[PDB]
Design a protein around this ligand. Structure first.
Ligand code: MVM
Ligand code: MG
Ligand code: MG
Ligand code: MG
Ligand code: MG
Ligand code: MG
Ligand code: MG
Ligand code: MG
Ligand code: MG
Ligand code: MG
Ligand code: MG
Ligand code: MG
Ligand code: MG
Ligand code: MG
Ligand code: MG
Ligand code: MG
Ligand code: MG
Ligand code: MG
Ligand code: MG
Ligand code: MG
Ligand code: MG
Ligand code: MG
Ligand code: MG
Ligand code: MG
Ligand code: MG
Ligand code: MG
Ligand code: MG
Ligand code: MG
Ligand code: MG
Ligand code: MG
Ligand code: MG
Ligand code: MG
Ligand code: MG
Ligand code: MG
Ligand code: MG
Ligand code: MG
Ligand code: MG
Ligand code: MG
Ligand code: MG
Ligand code: MG
Ligand code: MG
Ligand code: MG
Ligand code: MG
Ligand code: MG
Ligand code: MG
Ligand code: MG
Ligand code: MG
Ligand code: MG
Ligand code: MG
Ligand code: MG
Ligand code: MG
Ligand code: MG
Ligand code: MG
Ligand code: MG
Ligand code: MG
Ligand code: MG
Ligand code: MG
Ligand code: MG
Ligand code: ZN
Lengths: 135, 84, 122, 104, 50, 127, 39, 103, 58
RNA sequence: CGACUCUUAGCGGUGGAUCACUCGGCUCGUGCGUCGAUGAAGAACGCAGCUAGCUGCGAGAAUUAAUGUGAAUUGCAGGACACAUUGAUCAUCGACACUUCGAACGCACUUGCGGCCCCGGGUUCCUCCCGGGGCUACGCCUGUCUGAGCGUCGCUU
RNA sequence: CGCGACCUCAGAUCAGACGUGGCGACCCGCUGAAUUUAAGCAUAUUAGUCAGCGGAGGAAAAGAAACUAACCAGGAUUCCCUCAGUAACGGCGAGUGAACAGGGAAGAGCCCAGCGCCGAAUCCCCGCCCCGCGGGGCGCGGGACAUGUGGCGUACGGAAG
RNA sequence: AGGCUAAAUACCGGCACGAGACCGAUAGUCAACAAGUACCGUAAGGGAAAGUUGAAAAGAACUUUGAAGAGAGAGUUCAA
RNA sequence: GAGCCUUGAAGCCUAGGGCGCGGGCCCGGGUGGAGCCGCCGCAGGUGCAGAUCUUGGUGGUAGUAGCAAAUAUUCAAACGAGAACUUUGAAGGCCGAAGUGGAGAAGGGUUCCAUGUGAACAGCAGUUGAACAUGGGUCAGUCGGUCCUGAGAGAUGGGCG
């Protein structure tokens, strides 16, 4: 888990926030690996990833990348969705398998925290005080 | 000897005209820029100063190609010429 | 005299070159007149001469560009400015043929289950 | 207004620098430097508690009163002494409630 | 500074091009209310600073 | 009453488009009516003006029965200049006087191919 | 010209010494004189 | 801060609400948009009726609402098999198919 | 002569020959402080600067 | 009596309030929803007959071509006034063209120093010679070519 | 020792193609305070917001249940009115704060891995013709991907024979 | 515990566009005008003042004092 | 209101005539040059002495304080409307080689030079100037940058994020 980047343990805040050593950083390490692979090779598109190894400190993932402009993928129209340009850099908008599981979206009573789209969209509709012409 | 006597020892400039935004912030002794951030790739901007955005965003200069981008969008990018 | 582009399009480029040489000679001599004093009347002449210089270079490049197109036409791998410009998103859209290309499963689905016209009142 | 008159940045000077305790713009050379910043009593400040686009403009009336007012207005249009007392010219006009043919 | 790089001379060249007053035939045009160069620069009071 | 949702009743936009319309619209704005005998002969109400007409003034300080020739047209000033209409300065130099072309009656045209075509378009549209 | 030159002061700025001068700055001098005021 | 006999107020305004106010002013414009969308749908289809797919007969699910009856979603493939017609053929005919519904 | 600032001394030395058909002894250049380039061209001892001035017009 | 001072009023000056006007703002809504290695946004420099700004343009520089329009731009000269040639100006703009920096791209930035390939002239040629053109950034994909490995293995000495 | 086959690999100004930078009003992912409130102030609140960073399009995000319910049962997602200032959280203080039922607007469902059946029946690159314009797409021979698994038939509503 | 997808929806940037019980030059955007211009600070950055002749320049020819500014006559127009 | 007005509205002034207890108003007279009001309802950014208020302007103080650090000027002539200052001559002086001299680095950016003007600027004046206007001026194989490394700064490989 990540260490808070303030120097010498100086939060400059209330006693809520003095905890430099213990933060866990919400996103999963699998999505961290997907971010690094994608932004190192930004020309490609990230499909998914999986686990292959761990010993003490290093954790090892393998990431599948789909080429956008090869003709074998620009034909075969089951696959053209990733060539469609709304999927540039899926890993940083969190659309992958680990990305959805980090954003925390499902259905039902265990997911009222994000009612539609994301927690910010839910927060937007819940605290946007709505006013009509007639009240 | 703190004010007007010691102002007279100003002789060495620490800012030269940077080659990207022309706005005199190319700090030689750090070999960087102050305003635009020239040795970095990406252009320096911040949300905490609205007037910097108001001075350096698009629309201020020429938009000397973005004009004809709009003018070609108004018809939809033809490739033929006209009939006589 | 007047140097009309319509007149110039039938010309050969080796004569366009010599005509442009004469026009630049007129340019330089009237610019000497522009520097020296007694040139009350030659200065509208230097304006129409430089605008005549523009027309001939325009005709030359208009000829050379389409003459380049006439032997890269019908070819794969024609150069970059002769490729369609449009804009970057329109270059990087798929294709009309890749757009209309369909899998055999979806084709047989449309063949078995077509969309009908119906109406329901009576 | 919907936008700041707070485009200027400002601070006060304090008990020293005799003049006042209004915020002031900070600068020099340009002769706005040291004028009155945002506030009401200054030049080029925001108006007091400014107009906001969520003012309650529209008002609702009951539908029964909306129909009652139509009935009352049509009933007042029938009497001749009312409509001359508004300002029309019905002095040489036939009947009050005029009713022409459907050929019109 | 009596020896200086080339960008500085291009800058000072454009500033010497700028520093000149209004010709008189512009002052008598139609709909014109320009009377003088407000952007006029004097070398003692204002310094450009490179 | 205005029924298009794409033309302005707005005073500011109308004055702005008026005082900044380019020259090929200023031609249409500087338009004159024809005399009633010529509108009988040609079946057309109004025309744009040019350098070479024969022009009578209907109102102003210089009024009535003075059919002269136009010489210049400042479309920048929305003004034509008429050959008879003069005034001296203090120093005895004559100068033309500004007449807006709404106060102008055309008695003769200059005939030309494009004027024949415009006149035939006017007659064909008035039908 | 003579008329242009005679015109030129009447239009030539008149308010470039209207840099206004009197930002002034800070005091820190009047109170400096340590009178002590009942030490 | 309080006063005489008056009700305890806890309004929810401490959060900076004046930033995020979305206000109904484009409501008549949206009503005209949705009219033009429905008329465009009617002209863009054909003889096919507007609100084209048929909807079932469905009873609400709460000791409160089970007396009533509601236009449901789809026809519960057991019912659509008893009708004697194939699945996607019903979607082409204009018969709503919802496979999750149980009978 | 007044030369655009892109041109160097060898190109000036070629251009003066290829326009005026006279030799070039040597070429000095400077940047005139208005912004252009002022180029002095010394001619060969055979030719005449007065004749060349009369034949270019100045 | 005069001078001074005060108060009124007429006139005059300093001053720029009120009123009247508005090619300007602000708000609301509809329609559209478009940048970039084919070099963007931004910046620098340059350009008119007389030219500093603003504006508009890029060594074709106050616009070129083409289409429509149909006799002007304008402060002053001139210049094409041609129109029974092609036709001024202005708008539209789809064909050309687009200096240097700028993600900037031959390596850095001091306009410095290069390296190949090709073409015109040089000593009619390589050996640190003039002019011109092209190519020479990083990362990554598909394929080609070259070859490293006591990694695995065969056949052989 | 040489040669060949792979497997791991590097190089190239190799042939062709792609990514970077901007604007950021709306959207998406993370990070993230403090003034203030509580008449003091530590949890709380201000808020998972201002600022920061990375991305994206004309919309994005979401999405065809590991659901809601508990009775005569509904049925992907999105948005509005209600639910409701409620159940609930809280030095149970200040304050915070949902959701399913209901009615509307819009209406849309699908594919693959697995499993097995079809003699790799599949795709990419190069070269020649084919054809008609404003401009590029089917077919024929040889170089590759690929058996550590192209394609067809196939999806939990059952499917295949 | 693998994936795709229109609609209804948000939009103070942009592109044009139409309106207003809105302000009327100390107001309204800071910017009705050569405005992010002049200017200040090394820089981050800060940031103005400034609308109005007349219907038409018809802008005072000419005389006459004064070295000129300035003036007295005369003239323009309904008005100097 | 068949409201009012180029036969003169708004605004402004008024030792003019009046009304109301007042808030204020009505008319007369003069300027002024193109819009204005009464009434019934309606809606506001709606009435000033102050806030060491903000912005703009002008007073008293006042033709006053003050134009005093470094010894210093005088005569004649010239050009000129005009001479305590400009220029020439003569005389008397100062700086006195660690200078009030002769040239450069950094900085300044045309101030360099000539001609013309003396309206504003030079804190008196000026025929003068670094003021304004017009027009000129900076030439390098061998002077320096370019090249070298120093104190250091910074990229790929690598690691971290
Ligand atoms: O110059 C001043 C000076 C003197 C008085 C004021 N004051 N006091 N009240 C004032 C109100 C308005 C204006 N000025 C004011 C300001 C400054 N000096 C000084 N002297 C003594 C104490 C402090 C200082 Cl700073 C220097 C110091 C060294 C010797 N030479 C003189
Ligand atoms: Mg998705
Ligand atoms: Mg209420
Ligand atoms: Mg604010
Ligand atoms: Mg603010
Ligand atoms: Mg304001
Ligand atoms: Mg400065
Ligand atoms: Mg308006
Ligand atoms: Mg109380
Ligand atoms: Mg409570
Ligand atoms: Mg608060
Ligand atoms: Mg007075
Ligand atoms: Mg003023
Ligand atoms: Mg042409
Ligand atoms: Mg670089
Ligand atoms: Mg080359
Ligand atoms: Mg308190
Ligand atoms: Mg405290
Ligand atoms: Mg919180
Ligand atoms: Mg932010
Ligand atoms: Mg980006
Ligand atoms: Mg986009
Ligand atoms: Mg399912
Ligand atoms: Mg309730
Ligand atoms: Mg909360
Ligand atoms: Mg799923
Ligand atoms: Mg999924
Ligand atoms: Mg959608
Ligand atoms: Mg005013
Ligand atoms: Mg303002
Ligand atoms: Mg006028
Ligand atoms: Mg009058
Ligand atoms: Mg008027
Ligand atoms: Mg009244
Ligand atoms: Mg009144
Ligand atoms: Mg109001
Ligand atoms: Mg108020
Ligand atoms: Mg007051
Ligand atoms: Mg009071
Ligand atoms: Mg005060
Ligand atoms: Mg004051
Ligand atoms: Mg005073
Ligand atoms: Mg005294
Ligand atoms: Mg004294
Ligand atoms: Mg002294
Ligand atoms: Mg004399
Ligand atoms: Mg004398
Ligand atoms: Mg003296
Ligand atoms: Mg001595
Ligand atoms: Mg010395
Ligand atoms: Mg003086
Ligand atoms: Mg002199
Ligand atoms: Mg000098
Ligand atoms: Mg000067
Ligand atoms: Mg020599
Ligand atoms: Mg040396
Ligand atoms: Mg580093
Ligand atoms: Mg790295
Ligand atoms: Zn910069």
């Amino acid at each position: 888990g990540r260490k808070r980047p303030v120097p010498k343990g100086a939060t400059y805040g209330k006693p809520v926030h003095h905890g430099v050593n213990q933060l866990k950083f919400a996103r999963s390490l699998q999505s961290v690996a997907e971010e690094r692979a994608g932004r190192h090779c930004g020309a490609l598109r990230v499909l998914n990833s999986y686990w292959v190894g761990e010993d003490s400190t290093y954790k090892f993932f393998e990431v599948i990348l789909i080429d956008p402009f090869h003709k074998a993928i620009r034909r075969n129209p089951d696959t053209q969705w990733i060539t469609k340009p709304v999927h540039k850099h899926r890993e940083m908008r969190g659309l992958t398998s680990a990305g959805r599981k980090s954003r925390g979206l499902g259905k039902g009573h265990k997911f009222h925290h994000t009612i539609g789209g994301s927690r910010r969209a839910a927060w937007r509709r819940r605290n946007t005080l709505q006013l009509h012409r007639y009240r | 000897t703190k004010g007007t006597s010691s102002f007279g020892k100003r002789r060495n400039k620490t800012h030269t005209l940077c080659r990207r935004c022309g706005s005199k912030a190319y700090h030689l002794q750090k070999s960087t820029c102050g305003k635009c951030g020239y040795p970095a790739k990406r252009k320096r901007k911040y949300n905490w100063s609205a007037k910097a955005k108001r001075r350096n965003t698009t629309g201020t200069g020429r938009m000397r190609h973005l004009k004809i981008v709009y003018r070609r969008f108004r018809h939809g990018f033809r490739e033929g010429t006209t009939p006589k | 005299a007047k140097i009309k582009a319509r007149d110039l399009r039938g010309k050969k480029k080796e004569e366009l070159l010599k005509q442009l040489d004469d026009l630049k000679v007129e340019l330089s001599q009237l610019r000497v007149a522009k520097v020296t004093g007694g040139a009350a009347s030659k200065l509208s002449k230097i304006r129409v001469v430089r605008k005549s210089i523009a027309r001939v270079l325009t005709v030359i490049n208009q000829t050379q560009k389409e003459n380049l197109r006439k032997f890269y036409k019908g070819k794969k791998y024609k150069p970059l400015d002769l490729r369609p410009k449009k804009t970057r998103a329109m270059r990087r859209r798929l294709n009309k043929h890749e757009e209309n290309l369909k899998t055999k499963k979806q084709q047989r689905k449309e063949r078995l289950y077509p969309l009908r016209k119906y109406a329901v009142k009576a | 207004s919907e936008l700041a008159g707070h485009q200027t940045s400002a601070e006060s000077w304090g008990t020293g620098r005799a003049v006042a305790r209004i915020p002031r713009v900070r600068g020099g050379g340009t002769h706005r430097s040291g004028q009155g910043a945002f506030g009401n009593m200054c030049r080029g400040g925001r108006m007091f508690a400014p107009t906001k686009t969520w003012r309650r403009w529209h008002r609702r009336v009951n539908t029964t009163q909306k129909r009652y007012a139509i009935c009352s207005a049509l009933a007042a249009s029938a009497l001749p002494a009312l409509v001359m007392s508004k300002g029309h010219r019905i002095e040489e006009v036939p009947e009050l409630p005029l009713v022409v043919e459907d050929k019109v | 500074s009596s020896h200086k790089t080339f960008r500085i001379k291009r800058f000072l060249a454009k500033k010497q091009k700028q520093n000149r007053p209004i010709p008189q035939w512009i002052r008598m045009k139609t709909g014109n209310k320009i009377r003088y160069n407000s952007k006029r620069r004097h070398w003692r009071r204002t310094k450009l600073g490179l | 009453m205005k029924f298009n949702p794409f033309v302005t009743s707005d005073r500011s936009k109308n004055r702005k488009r008026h005082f900044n319309a380019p020259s090929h619209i200023r031609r249409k704005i500087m338009s004159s009516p024809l005399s009633k005998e010529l509108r009988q002969k040609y079946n057309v109400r109004s025309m744009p003006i040019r350098k070479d007409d024969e022009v009578q003034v209907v109102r102003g300080h210089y009024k009535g029965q003075q059919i002269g020739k136009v010489v210049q047209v400042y479309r920048k000033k929305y003004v034509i200049y008429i050959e008879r209409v003069q005034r001296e300065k203090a120093n005895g130099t004559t100068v033309h006087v500004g007449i807006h072309p709404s106060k102008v009656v055309i008695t003769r045209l200059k005939l030309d191919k494009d004027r024949k075509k415009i006149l035939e378009r006017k007659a064909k549209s008035r039908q | 010209g003579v008329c242009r030159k005679a015109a030129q002061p009447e239009e030539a700025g008149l308010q470039i010494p209207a840099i206004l001068g009197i930002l002034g700055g800070i005091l820190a001098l009047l109170i400096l004189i340590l009178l002590l005021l009942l030490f | 801060a309080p006063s005489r006999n008056g009700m305890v107020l806890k309004p929810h305004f401490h959060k900076d609400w004046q930033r995020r106010v979305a206000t109904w002013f484009n409501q008549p414009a949206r009503k005209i948009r949705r009219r033009k969308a429905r008329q465009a749908k009617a002209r863009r289809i054909a003889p096919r009726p507007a609100s084209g797919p048929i909807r079932p007969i469905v009873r609400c699910p709460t000791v409160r609402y089970h007396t009533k009856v509601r236009a449901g979603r789809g026809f519960s493939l057991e019912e659509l098999r008893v009708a004697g017609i194939h699945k996607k053929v019903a979607r082409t005919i204009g018969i709503s198919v919802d496979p999750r519904r149980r009978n | 002569f007044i030369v655009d600032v892109k041109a160097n001394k060898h190109q000036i030395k070629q251009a003066v020959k290829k326009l005026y058909d006279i030799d070039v002894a040597k070429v000095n250049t400077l940047i005139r402080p208005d912004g252009e380039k002022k180029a002095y061209v010394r001619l060969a001892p055979d030719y005449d600067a007065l004749d060349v001035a009369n034949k270019i017009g100045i």
